[PDB]
């Protein structure tokens, strides 16, 4: 359906080029962080159309020296056209804020669902991991590293399909090159990142193993009382970890194959690439075709009554903060 899809995407681009911020009403808050907030917004002329608007304070970006990361986030997410990646339709800007008009996924944050349930069963975790694998296949085929994989970066749509959000640390990297930024909490850093050896797409495969473990247990496999102990545990290796009994044999095999120390040895980096992950015995009987067609039934069916239903999210108080200072540095010229 390539010609149909291209026509649909062109029509979308033309549709969003014409919108202004005054075309939207704020419905409710979907998330609050240090970056800013994510507000559910409703198009005034078509009340069935709602979106997740991420609103970031520009001065806080400058203070944290995240300008390049944010520009990369916009470029990568706005150019990505994947059913397993939250769409970024367009951006806005004024002197104090950046605005990112994203696809609204009202099934809820995977991290809050994981919190409520404690842990996910094997088949549930398998569905979510397959969603991540498809997203990674797309990005890596485009030479993009995601880096920031964790439950907080996955969100469910109204169907229960999981999609990657937050591309703040995503980065395009050349063949035969590496990047050096230490991103993410200490529990999620690959060994090459801990040892300051540089990293590439292979680090994503490490994170995939971590994510499976966390989804199956509620906690990532390497965690100490302090960051240095955490890194020493990571250097000790996935094979030195005492896996809990609930993790199935094949899941443990796949986790160990993704979390190998040598980046060139990790599953997904070998001769058949991501196929080696998809063909792993853990995915025996998993219908990848049905997942990409949307016909596979998700493990958790969200209840969403309408495009303005935010009941799958935690409640958040309205923004009452002092506005940040203006930022006219011009680094946001493309927004």
């Amino acid at each position: 359906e390539d010609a149909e899809a291209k026509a649909k995407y062109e029509a979308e681009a033309a549709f969003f080029a014409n919108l202004k911020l005054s075309d939207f009403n704020i419905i409710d808050t979907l998330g609050v962080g240090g970056f800013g907030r994510v507000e559910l917004v409703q198009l005034k002329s078509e009340e069935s159309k709602t979106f997740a608007m991420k609103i970031l304070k520009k001065r806080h970006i400058v203070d944290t020296r995240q300008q390049e990361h944010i520009r990369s986030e916009k470029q990568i997410m706005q150019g990505a056209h994947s059913d397993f990646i939250v769409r970024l339709y367009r951006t806005f800007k004024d002197s104090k804020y950046l605005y990112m008009l994203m696809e609204a996924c009202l099934g809820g944050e995977l991290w809050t669902i994981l919190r409520d349930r404690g842990s996910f069963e094997d088949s549930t975790t398998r569905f979510y991991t397959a969603c991540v694998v498809e997203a990674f296949a797309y990005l890596h085929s485009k030479g993009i590293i995601y880096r920031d994989l964790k439950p907080e970066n996955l969100i469910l749509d109204h169907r229960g399909y999981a999609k990657l959000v937050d591309f703040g640390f995503a980065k395009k990297i050349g063949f035969g090159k590496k990047t050096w930024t230490f991103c993410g909490t200490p529990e999620y850093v690959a060994p090459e990142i801990i040892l300051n050896k540089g990293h590439d797409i292979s680090a994503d495969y490490w994170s995939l193993g971590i994510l499976m473990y966390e989804l199956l247990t509620g906690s990532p496999p390497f965690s100490g009382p302090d960051p240095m102990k955490t890194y020493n545990i990571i250097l000790r290796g996935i094979d030195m970890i005492e896996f809990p009994k609930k993790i199935a044999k094949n899941a443990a095999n796949l986790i160990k194959k993704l979390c190998r120390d040598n980046p060139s040895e990790r599953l997904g980096n070998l001769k058949n690439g991501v196929k080696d992950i998809q063909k792993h015995k853990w995915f025996e009987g998993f219908n990848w075709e049905g997942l990409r067609k949307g016909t596979l039934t998700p493990p958790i069916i969200p209840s969403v009554a309408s495009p303005t239903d935010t009941s799958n999210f935690d409640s958040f108080p309205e923004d009452n903060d002092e506005p940040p200072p203006d930022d006219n540095s011009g680094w946001d010229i493309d927004f």
Side-chain angles (χ1 to χ4, degrees), residues 2-5 7 10-19 21-25 27-45 47-67 69-74 76-125 127-171 174-184 186-188 190-193 196 198-225 227 230-232 234 237-241 243-244 247-255 258-259 261-263 266 268-270 272-274 276-278 280 282-288 290-292 294-317 319-332 334-335:
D2 204 23
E4 307 186 55
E10 306 290 49
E12 277 179 8
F15 172 88
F16 287 107
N18 186 52
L19 295 184
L21 286 168
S22 55
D23 290 322
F24 301 87
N25 275 136
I27 299 309
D28 266 310
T29 298
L30 295 168
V32 172
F35 59 93
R37 319 169 58 91
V38 179
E39 312 281 6
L40 185 68
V41 299
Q42 184 184 44
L43 198 69
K44 289 173 174 180
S45 62
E47 299 198 344
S48 67
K49 296 206 152 24
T50 54
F51 307 85
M53 179 85 80
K54 186 150 87 170
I55 309 174
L56 303 87
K57 323 193 211 194
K58 295 176 28 184
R59 185 59 188 276
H60 177 265
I61 290 172
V62 169
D63 288 352
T64 48
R65 292 141 93 81
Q66 297 294 301
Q67 297 99 317
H69 282 165
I70 297 305
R71 304 175 65 149
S72 181
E73 168 176 12
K74 168 190 166 76
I76 292 169
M77 197 185 305
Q78 197 158 344
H81 283 90
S82 166
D83 289 324
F84 304 92
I85 305 167
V86 169
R87 295 282 315 277
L88 174 57
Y89 294 113
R90 65 156 300 161
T91 59
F92 303 89
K93 65 171 185 300
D94 59 30
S95 284
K96 297 182 182 306
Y97 308 93
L98 307 177
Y99 308 86
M100 294 183 58
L101 186 77
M102 314 199 271
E103 166 187 10
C105 299
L106 301 164
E109 305 268 16
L110 198 59
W111 78 266
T112 65
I113 295 161
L114 180 63
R115 169 207 65 200
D116 299 339
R117 301 201 174 199
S119 62
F120 291 156
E121 306 285 18
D122 198 79
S123 43
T124 305
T125 293
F127 180 93
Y128 295 142
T129 304
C131 293
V132 179
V133 169
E134 289 301 299
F136 276 6
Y138 179 86
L139 296 164
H140 299 171
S141 73
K142 288 168 79 175
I144 297 164
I145 182 184
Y146 183 70
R147 289 207 281 196
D148 209 18
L149 181 64
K150 51 186 156 69
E152 290 81 7
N153 286 34
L154 296 154
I155 196 165
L156 316 173
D157 70 0
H158 59 275
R159 298 177 294 159
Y161 275 67
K163 307 187 172 222
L164 279 180
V165 279
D166 194 9
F167 280 67
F169 297 128
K171 191 180 194 192
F175 168 82
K177 303 303 202 260
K178 293 174 177 176
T179 190
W180 299 84
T181 305
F182 202 113
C183 328
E187 304 152 29
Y188 296 105
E192 63 263 28
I193 296 169
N196 196 23
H199 54 284
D200 53 29
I201 287 181
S202 148
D204 275 345
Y205 299 129
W206 169 279
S207 68
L208 186 61
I210 306 290
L211 170 81
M212 310 166 117
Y213 197 105
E214 183 166 2
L215 292 181
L216 290 165
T217 66
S219 303
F222 318 99
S223 184
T230 304
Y231 285 330
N232 205 328
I234 291 161
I238 195 55
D239 300 302
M240 299 307 293
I241 290 295
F243 275 54
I247 301 180
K249 167 172 70 129
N250 287 135
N253 184 290
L254 180 41
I255 293 174
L258 295 158
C259 289
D261 289 342
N262 191 315
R266 286 174 195 157
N269 233 357
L270 313 179
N272 296 329
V274 71
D276 288 315
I277 297 172
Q278 309 170 299
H280 186 280
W282 191 55
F283 289 111
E284 181 165 62
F286 186 87
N287 184 25
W288 294 96
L291 181 89
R292 313 167 174 122
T295 59
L296 182 54
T297 304
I300 298 168
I301 309 303
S303 184
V304 180
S306 96
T308 63
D309 185 1
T310 64
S311 56
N312 295 142
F313 299 79
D314 294 345
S315 303
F316 299 100
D319 185 292
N320 54 32
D321 302 27
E322 209 173 339
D326 291 10
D327 167 50
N328 304 291
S329 307
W331 65 270
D332 64 343
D334 293 323
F335 278 72

